[PDB]
Design a protein around this ligand. Structure first.
Ligand SMILES: Cc1cc2nc3c(=O)[nH]c(=O)nc-3n(C[C@H](O)[C@H](O)[C@H](O)COP(=O)(O)O)c2cc1C
Ligand SMILES: CC(C)[C@H]1CC(=O)c2nnn(-c3cc(F)c(-c4cc(CO)ccc4F)c(F)c3)c2C1
Ligand SMILES: CCCCCCCCCCCC[N+](C)(C)[O-]
Ligand SMILES: O=C(O)c1cc(=O)[nH]c(=O)[nH]1
Ligand SMILES: [Cl-]
Ligand SMILES: [Cl-]
Ligand SMILES: [Cl-]
Ligand code: NA
Ligand code: NA
Length: 366
């Protein structure tokens, strides 16, 4: 319990929520972050938190999930905030505006958010040039254990989804440590159908071919990001395809189109993906299942409702090598990053783990 954590949680964030609608608050958050207007993280990462996965060193396992920095404007500010890795996007091939406003809603009683942004994106070319301006800076960050992920989406009016993703691989693959084939946004019509076995195998074969065609030092890992709302059949199929094709990892999960019993927020019946605490254990269980179905051989980035060391460790023990958060930032602000890391370190020690690596999938070993 630092001074900052309580001040943000009790005073700063609630005031900011009281003054600004969620989307305006997000825009401001991105601006402040990009300008480095936040305390440089006091928490120095211990060796216990280092993870080697996806061909890279991660100095800590807590990343910022896709959707916070959709257009790659705040990457350096986000490392300053203490994230061990940054994922930008989703980025679509052509610029597009997304859905009409309002399209983001706070459920404070639930520590949740509902969003239906619809892939608002500056597009590949703008993001390409943004990353190019700091490409060597990123190379040094990556070498120092702070990798960069790029999450790829598809345009609303695209006729050929696989070609949209292929374009993303070719344009931003060379600038990324890993790419994410996001087939699980609930806010683009027909997108989640790309998670079906036949469609997925064809899509991912094309994506991997394009990736393999990049020069070695510009060749990223490829992960698939999946929904929390999959049937058992869907999960079996995804596991099979991912192993068959040698997909490098999974991101588990996106937001849910379900509305768990017990939501209190007035805005609970808004259309969109639900994030935050009501998603937490649904996500953890999806991690648990996907880890088992892939025999622990496919790295998982665990995401959904993380705002504490316990939340993080539950996902790690269920099978995640790394975790991400987003919605917690809306309620706790920047201090939540150091909080999660500090609490995670303490729990690892308490439960007899030498470090994060020892805890990955530990629940499955009884
Ligand atoms: C406002 C908002 C926008 C998001 N945009 C994206 C996106 O563009 N691409 C994506 O893969 N996930 C997106 N997500 C999903 C998050 O990356 C994450 O998977 C999900 O919110 C669960 O984590 P959380 O409970 O910590 O927020 C978005 C989430 C929110 C709340
Ligand atoms: C969809 C998400 C993003 C929004 C949902 C929502 O309704 C909301 N309400 N407040 N808030 C928010 C506002 C902020 F200004 C910061 C922030 C503040 C500082 C100043 O030290 C530095 C960096 C930051 F990111 C923050 F982390 C979250 C959000 C985010
Ligand atoms: C600031 C509000 C705090 C909300 C904290 C919520 C704790 C977990 C309860 C949500 C569980 C949803 N469920 C049933 C799908 O697991
Ligand atoms: O842009 C959006 O609406 C969006 C994309 C995604 O992948 N997940 C989410 O919750 N929203
Ligand atoms: Cl480049
Ligand atoms: Cl060559
Ligand atoms: Cl209702
Ligand atoms: Na299927
Ligand atoms: Na999370």
């Amino acid at each position: 319990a630092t001074g900052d954590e309580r001040f943000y949680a009790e005073h700063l964030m609630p005031t900011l929520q009281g003054l600004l609608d969620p989307e305006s608050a997000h825009r401001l958050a991105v601006r402040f972050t990009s300008l480095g207007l936040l305390p440089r993280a006091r928490f120095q990462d211990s060796d216990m938190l280092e993870v080697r996965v996806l061909g890279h060193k991660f100095r800590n396992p807590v990343g910022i999930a896709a959707g916070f920095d959709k257009h790659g404007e705040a990457v350096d500010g986000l490392y300053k905030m203490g994230f061990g890795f940054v994922e930008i996007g989703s980025v679509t091939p052509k610029p597009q505006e997304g859905n009409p406003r309002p399209r983001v809603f706070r459920l404070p009683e639930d520590q949740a958010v509902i969003n239906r942004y619809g892939f608002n994106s500056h597009g590949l070319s703008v993001v390409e040039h943004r990353l190019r301006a700091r490409q060597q800076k990123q190379a040094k960050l990556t070498e120092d254990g702070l990798p960069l992920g790029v999450n790829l989406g598809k345009n609303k009016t695209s006729v050929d989804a696989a070609e949209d993703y292929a374009e993303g691989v070719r344009v931003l693959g060379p600038l990324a440590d890993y790419l994410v084939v996001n087939v699980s946004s609930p806010n683009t019509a027909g997108l989640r159908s790309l998670q079906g076995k036949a469609e997925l195998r064809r899509l991912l074969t094309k994506v991997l071919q394009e990736r393999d065609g990049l020069r070695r030092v510009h060749r990223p890992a490829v992960l698939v990001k999946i929904a929390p709302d999959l049937t058992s059949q869907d999960k079996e199929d995804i596991a099979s395809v991912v192993k068959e094709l040698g997909i490098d990892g999974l991101i588990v999960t996106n937001t849910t189109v379900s509305r768990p019993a017990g939501l209190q927020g007035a805005l609970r019946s808004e259309t969109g993906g639900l994030s935050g605490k009501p998603l937490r254990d649904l996500s953890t269980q999806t991690i648990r299942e996907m880890y088992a179905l892939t025999q622990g051989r496919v790295p998982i980035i665990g995401v959904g409702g993380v705002s504490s060391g316990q939340d993080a460790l539950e996902k790690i023990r269920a099978g995640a090598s790394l975790v991400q958060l987003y919605t917690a930032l809306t309620f706790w602000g920047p201090p939540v990053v150091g909080k999660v890391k500090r609490e995670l370190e303490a729990l690892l020690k308490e439960q007899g783990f030498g470090g994060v690596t020892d805890a990955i999938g530990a629940d499955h070993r009884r």
